[PDB]
């Protein structure tokens, strides 16, 4: 359809409004500290950001 209904449904909040900043996944997001990264992607890159294991 035209622009009046193609993206008409609001996504200004809710689970569909948020996606992973790496793989654009819509499940298991980590919004803490504005990380905005998927759980799998965070485990993949936590050494790179700097979250290292201590205990």
């Amino acid at each position: 359809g035209h622009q009046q209904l193609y993206w008409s449904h609001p996504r200004k909040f809710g689970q569909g409004s948020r996606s992973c900043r790496v793989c654009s996944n819509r499940h298991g997001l980590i919004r803490k500290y504005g990380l905005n990264m998927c759980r799998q992607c965070f485990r993949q890159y936590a050494k790179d950001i700097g979250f290292i294991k201590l205990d």
């Binding site: 900043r21 500290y33 790179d48």
Partner: protein, 114 residues
């Protein structure tokens, strides 16, 4: 102040920038013997230093490719213009870089070697 975010979020954003830049350099400089990324940030400007084996290969005709990557990193993260510089550094003892050796092994396997 209000314009600047908290320190925790700032460190998180720095880590995000580091990881994204590392991924971009990995996917872009894979055939150029990429080793790793080192960034030096100052309030005046930022300095990004790439560790790689073939500096003459990552650098295009009269530094064409290094200019291309500098423009890419200028555009994507929205730095102030002229506040980022890209240095390509030849690594020491490239046999000690697991990234470079793994990429070379992948190159060998893609070549058809057993």
């Amino acid at each position: 102040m209000a314009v600047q975010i908290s320190k925790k979020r700032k460190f998180v954003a720095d880590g995000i920038f580091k990881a994204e830049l590392n991924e971009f350099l990995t996917r872009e400089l894979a055939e150029d013997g990429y080793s790793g990324v080192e960034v030096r940030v100052t309030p005046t400007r930022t300095e990004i230093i790439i560790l790689a084996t073939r500096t003459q290969n990552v650098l295009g005709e009269k530094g064409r490719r290094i200019r291309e990557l500098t423009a890419v990193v200028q555009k994507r993260f929205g730095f102030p213009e002229g506040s980022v510089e890209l240095y390509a550094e030849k690594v020491a003892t490239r046999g000690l870089c697991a990234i470079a050796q793994a990429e070379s092994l992948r190159y060998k396997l893609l070549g058809g070697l057993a």
